[PDB]
């Protein structure tokens, strides 16, 4: 049927589980929606400038920067808590059922994350959904972050797959744009606080679902059309 | 003496002048600090994937996306207002004095912006500070945004200048990182809600000021130390 390549943080695992840390440190859970795009921004800046550091180190550095920007106090224990929550986000309840149906439909399932290879147990293992996937790939071998082309290309090469066989699944349009620019298909799942970007000559996702169930429905239905 | 290459939006011109629009549309002026990094994120995503649209178009599209993320209504009026405000930000009071001091100390002054060329009068002309600068450069001919190396390289090329003669000045650490990776110096001015990113292996700015006056102190001091 094809190979479905899933983004992990926010797409499969619930980023809003971090909200209490932001509520406490900043007095405002909404700062999550400042910090996260700043993290992605700086990951792309390092990539563009020829620098690489593991994603989690950037996450901590950006948390400290955002703290400083809000004049909010941060301790070594706050950073520890950030690590704890970021590496242990629970799976949305729509995930295990959707992955089950995609497997039943004959799709091969893979993950691809900006996060560095993790000591066991990984975030996916802690969430109890790691075993759905035949491979768990990361940006390690590319030393560059999404949406750099090397990331998708090295993934395709690793899987022995052509672009036409692959579909990148994410709640981040930057990730689907990245994959589609390399000739993959893109499937967008509309997690809270994520919507597509409508901009001329920027590719729109091939599939859109309001949640993982609906996206899976569309992926499965497109097999019979 | 050297050439000082200034970022424009937020660095020289006051981005908080947009706050009332965010207050009206979102009920919360602080959404400025979610939209702006999303805008920079998407500018770098387009650059990484080989796509280009003018910065203002991205700004509008990201405004619409952030609005949708907040379930906030957006009208054509709001979009025209964003355009008007983004092209009419006033100069901070500290700018003209700092530029006068730097010019009188013998520095050559240039601007470099992600923003596309405008018809006259430019935002810098309207703000009354365009005359300090010998050149006004943009990423538009490069069709790539900061911090892509092409931006800084094509700038040095246009000026007929060597990297050792150039210093990038910005309140955005992504911009200084971009320039320093090309062997320019970097000068950071700490505009409200901007602070440096402390990350191993990523160069710190050569010069740091809490305002343009303090940064100019440091630049001027470096001439005879």
Q: Which domains does chain A have, with CATH numbers?
A: 1-14+88-225 (3.40.50.1000), 15-87 (1.10.150.240)
List, edge to edge, every strand of the sheet that includes B166-170. Answer: B135-138, B108-113, B3-6, B166-170, B185-189, B207-209
CA distances from B68 to A71, A112, A127 (A): 29, 27, 30
B22 close to A (CB below 8 A): no
- Determine the residue of chain A that is closest to B35 in CA distance: A34
Q: How far is A64 from chain B (nearest CA, A)?
A: 8
Give A38 to chain B, closest Cα distance, Å. Answer: 6
In sequence order, the 6+-apart residues with CB closer than 8 A to the CB of B23 are B29
Query: Angle CA(B53)–CA(B57)–CA(B61) in degrees, nearest 5?
Result: 115
**Which among A188, A168, A208, A172 is positioned nearest to A40, based on CA atoms?**
A172
Which residue in B38, B71, B147, B201 has the most chain A C-beta atoms within 10 A of its own C-beta, making it the best mutation to test that interface? Answer: B38
CA A3 to chain CA centroid, nearest Å: 17
For residues A185 and A176, what is the distance between their CA atoms, to the nearest angstrom? 8
CB nearest A197 (choices: B50, B61, B193): B61
Nearest CA-CA distance, residue A8 and chain B, Å: 19
Geometric angle at alpha carbon A109, from A108 and A110, rounded to 5°: 125
Instruction: Write out the two tokens for B35.
Output: 């939209």
Residue A152 parent element (H or E): helix A149-159
Could you tell me if B29 lies within 8 Å of chain A, comparing CB atoms? no
Q: Say whether B41 and A37 touch across the interface (CB within 8 A).
A: yes
**CA–CA separation, A111 and A155 (whole Å):** 10
Q: How was this structure determined?
A: X-ray
Q: Decide if B45 and A148 are in contact by the 8 Å CB cutoff.
A: no
Token pair 């490069």 is found at: B142
Q: How is the beta sheet containing A207-209 ordered, strand by strand?
A: A135-138, A108-113, A3-6, A166-170, A185-189, A207-209
Cross-chain residue pair A177–B37, CB shorter than 8 Å: no
**3-class state of residue B94 by DSSP:** coil
| Resolution, expressed in angstroms to one decimal | 1.7
């Amino acid at each position: 049927s094809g190979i479905l390549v899933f983004d992990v943080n926010e797409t499969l695992l619930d980023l809003t589980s971090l909200s209490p840390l932001f509520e406490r440190v900043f007095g405002d859970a909404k700062v999550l929606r400042e910090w996260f795009p700043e993290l992605i921004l700086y990951s792309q800046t390092l990539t563009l400038t020829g620098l690489y550091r593991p994603f989690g180190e950037i996450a901590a550095a950006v948390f400290e920067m955002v703290a400083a920007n809000h004049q909010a106090k941060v301790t070594p224990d706050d950073i520890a808590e950030l690590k704890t929550r970021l590496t242990s986000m629970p799976a949305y309840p729509d995930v295990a059922p959707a992955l089950t149906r995609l497997q039943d439909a004959g799709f091969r399932l893979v993950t691809l994350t900006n996060s560095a290879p993790s000591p066991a147990p990984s975030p996916l293992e802690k969430a109890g959904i790691a075993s759905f996937f035949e491979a768990h790939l990361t940006v390690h071998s590319s030393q560059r972050f999404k949406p750099h082309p090397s990331v998708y290309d090295s993934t395709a090469e690793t899987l022995g797959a052509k672009p036409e066989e692959l579909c990148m699944i994410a709640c981040h349009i930057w990730d689907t744009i990245g994959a589609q620019a390399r000739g993959w298909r893109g499937g967008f799942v509309a997690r809270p606080h994520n919507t597509p970007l409508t901009l001329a000559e920027v590719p729109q996702p091939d599939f859109i679902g309001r949640d993982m169930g609906e996206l899976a429905d569309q992926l499965i239905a497109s097999l019979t059309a």
